[PDB]
């Protein structure tokens, strides 16, 4: 009788103790001990390689183990892979669709991954030996535009699309191994753990769930935010994360906490922001905001370390190499700037 | 060596730039296109009737040594919040409305809000929409026969009447003139309700005859362009 | 934790008065242009009424236009449509479907259900 009713009441009941669990653990916030630790100051970092060879706008990218190359996409149906050290487009896919809004190097610099308004996931081979690039398996599952994708190995992949679900993909077969479902809204990005063991994926429905790879099943759901988070980036410790929404508000959430450890809100700032990720050590945190500029944000002082000029369109993509070199960020007038 | 890898890296990262100064030209003389609607509105019939022609994502013509790239979406969800925004770059947002279907739902209001959800984005506020009206031959058999009238979705219509910059059609009574006018003036009205200039709308009626309509999408791309232009020079 | 509680309705003569009260917790209420979209049984979902992040930019669907009157209130944070002068086609559920974006004034929530900031419905129902 009324299993709906009932049902959706139950849950919300369960949505309540969670909530009343986390409060329990939340005597304080991570601001409490801002007052032990110094700050960084308000670094102002420089465009050392630029990378202007899009036609049109940079709508993701990657990078890659060896820090030195980058992937990029665009609208203008080309990939481009760029060597950030002496300032070279190393390859130039031409891809199959001209929107494509995702981006994944690999962990070996083998393998690229593609995606956008096709819902297909095209890969690329990077050192074939065949010459050129090549389409090296086209990834077919998926109802929706791909909005990021990750790599996990030259054999599976994952890719959190549009379609409500992400799919941790296999290059050897062509078919979702797993699919990760419990998404209300469409997926915006996704990020993996230093670990890879269990990746993060923020969705429209301010939901930035932790699903685990090996099981495939949701490990925790974080709703704290208030918009689409069309950003998210785990942080380098492996245990947290950040999201940033189109609420113009990041939030730092922890997979042992359950809940937001730090809220980088500020007045001046009013636009979503669609690009984040964490330094080396993961105390700046940084946010590519729709004002055309990135905010590079104290992680553990709840203030941003520094505005970041150059960009005159939406920043849409940022990446920060995996030793922290340099963070580049990808806008939409077809640049590719590079900070450090 | 010192020079060895990167005299190579260096020559194909020229081949790389002669390829890409090559495709600029091409994705600057190809005017993308979002053709999009509020559902069953006819986009299929629009791809139909262009140059007589993987399910439906993009499709392509040329006219005038113009080639398009019209990219449908007909295989998308239904959250548009975010896959829209990737046609920022993009010349045109073809909206192929049903002047017809305003009976089943409302399909109308559905596409004046997913209009004025494409005037007034952050994004989309700089790109013009061609606005199709499709099924106006529909249209013409739904108000004169009194099945479907646009007072049950739009009050609006009762103090409407049809402008004096109207274009009658022979064969066509003025109560279907006033009706049809009156969905160009209702999107209308949200197209001059932001009035920044960037982007103005283009309302055209089709799937009323057969014929060439690659023609009324190049002609309003070209004043897109135009006071695209325009707009650029502080001419508009 | 990003919820709407739409309160109110019921089983109302047509033609009466009817309050939908929708309680919106865990965002600022004085930033989203909220609005109300409403699902008729067995149809899709539709667009009822709208308002800015103030107050100012008021609209509703040509089906309510004049009946309705949306208000934000961003002391509580609650969004109130007052239904009047009901119509026998206003039967349906009404959802409190809020804007996706904050400080814009484009809402892509009129779009088909599994929307991401959608409340439960109230199901305003007419009498007979």
């Known amino acids: 009788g009324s299993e709906l009713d009932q049902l959706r009441q139950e849950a919300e009941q369960l949505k309540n103790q969670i909530r009343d669990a986390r409060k329990a653990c939340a005597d304080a916030t991570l601001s409490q001990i801002t007052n032990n630790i110094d700050p960084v100051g308000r670094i102002q970092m420089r465009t050392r390689r630029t990378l202007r060879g899009h036609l049109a706008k940079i709508y993701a990218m990657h990078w890659g183990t060896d820090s030195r190359l980058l992937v990029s996409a665009s609208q203008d149906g080309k990939l481009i892979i760029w060597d950030s050290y002496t300032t070279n487009k190393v390859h130039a896919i031409p891809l199959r669709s001209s929107w494509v809004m995702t981006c994944a190097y690999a962990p070996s610099g083998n393998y690229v991954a593609c995606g956008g308004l096709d819902n297909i996931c095209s890969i690329y081979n990077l050192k074939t030996r065949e010459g050129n690039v090549r389409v090296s398996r086209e990834l077919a599952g998926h109802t929706g535009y791909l909005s990021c994708c990750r790599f996990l190995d030259d054999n599976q992949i994952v890719t959190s699309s549009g379609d409500t679900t992400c799919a941790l993909w296999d290059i050897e077969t062509g078919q979702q191994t797993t699919t990760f479902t419990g998404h209300t809204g469409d997926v915006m990005s996704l990020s993996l753990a230093p670990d890879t063991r269990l990746f993060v994926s923020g969705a429209c429905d301010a939901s930035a769930k932790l699903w685990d790879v090996r099981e495939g099943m949701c490990r925790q759901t974080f709703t704290g935010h208030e918009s689409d988070i069309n950003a998210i980036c785990f942080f380098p410790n492996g245990n947290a994360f950040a999201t940033g929404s189109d609420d113009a508000t990041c939030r730092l959430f922890d997979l042992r906490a359950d809940q937001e450890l730090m809220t980088y809100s500020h007045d001046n700032i009013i636009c979503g922001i669609t690009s984040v990720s964490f330094s080396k050590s993961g105390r700046l945190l940084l946010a590519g905001y729709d004002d055309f500029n990135c905010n590079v944000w104290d992680a553990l002082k709840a203030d941003r370390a520094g505005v970041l000029a150059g960009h005159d369109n939406r920043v849409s993509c940022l990446g920060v190499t995996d030793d922290g070199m340099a963070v580049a960020t990808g806008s939409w007038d077809s640049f590719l700037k590079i900070w450090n | 060596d010192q020079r060895n890898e990167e005299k190579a890296q260096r020559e194909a990262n020229k081949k790389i730039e002669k390829q890409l100064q090559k495709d600029k030209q091409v994705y600057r003389a190809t005017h993308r296109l979002l053709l999009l609607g509020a559902g069953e509105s006819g986009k299929s019939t629009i791809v139909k009737q262009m140059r007589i022609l993987t399910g439906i994502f993009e499709t392509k013509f040329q006219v005038d040594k113009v080639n398009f790239h019209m990219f449908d979406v007909g295989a998308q969800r239904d959250e548009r919040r975010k896959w829209i925004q990737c046609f920022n770059d993009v010349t045109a947002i073809i909206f192929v409305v049903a002047s017809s279907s305003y009976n089943m739902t409302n399909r109308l209001q559905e596409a004046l809000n997913l209009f004025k959800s494409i005037w007034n984005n952050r994004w989309l506020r700089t790109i013009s929409v061609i606005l199709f009206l499709n099924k106006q031959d529909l249209l013409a058999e739904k108000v004169l026969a009194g099945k479907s009238k646009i007072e049950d979705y739009f009050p609006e219509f009762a103090r409407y009447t049809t402008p004096e910059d109207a274009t009658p059609e022979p064969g066509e009574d003025p109560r279907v003139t006033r009706a049809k006018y009156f969905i160009r003036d209702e999107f209308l009205r949200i197209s001059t309700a932001s009035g920044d200039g960037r982007h103005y709308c283009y309302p055209h009626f089709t799937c009323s005859v057969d014929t060439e309509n690659i023609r009324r999408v190049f002609n309003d791309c070209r004043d897109i362009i135009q006071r695209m232009h325009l707009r650029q020079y502080e001419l508009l | 934790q990003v919820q709407l509680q739409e309160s109110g309705g019921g089983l109302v003569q047509p033609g009466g008065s009817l309050r939908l009260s929708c309680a919106a917790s865990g965002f600022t209420f004085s930033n989203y242009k909220m609005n109300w979209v409403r699902q008729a049984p067995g149809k899709g979902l539709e667009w009822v009424s709208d308002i800015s992040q103030s107050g100012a930019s008021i609209s509703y669907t040509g089906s309510v236009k004049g009946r309705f009157t949306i208000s934000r209130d961003n002391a509580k944070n609650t969004l109130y449509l007052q239904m009047n002068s009901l119509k026998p086609e206003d039967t349906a559920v009404y959802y409190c479907?809020?804007?996706?974006?904050?400080?814009?004034?484009?809402?892509?929530?009129?779009?088909?259900?599994?929307?991401?900031?959608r409340g439960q419905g109230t199901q305003v129902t007419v009498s007979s």
């Open positions: 479907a809020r804007c996706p974006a904050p400080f814009t004034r484009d809402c892509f929530d009129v779009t088909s259900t599994t929307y991401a900031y």
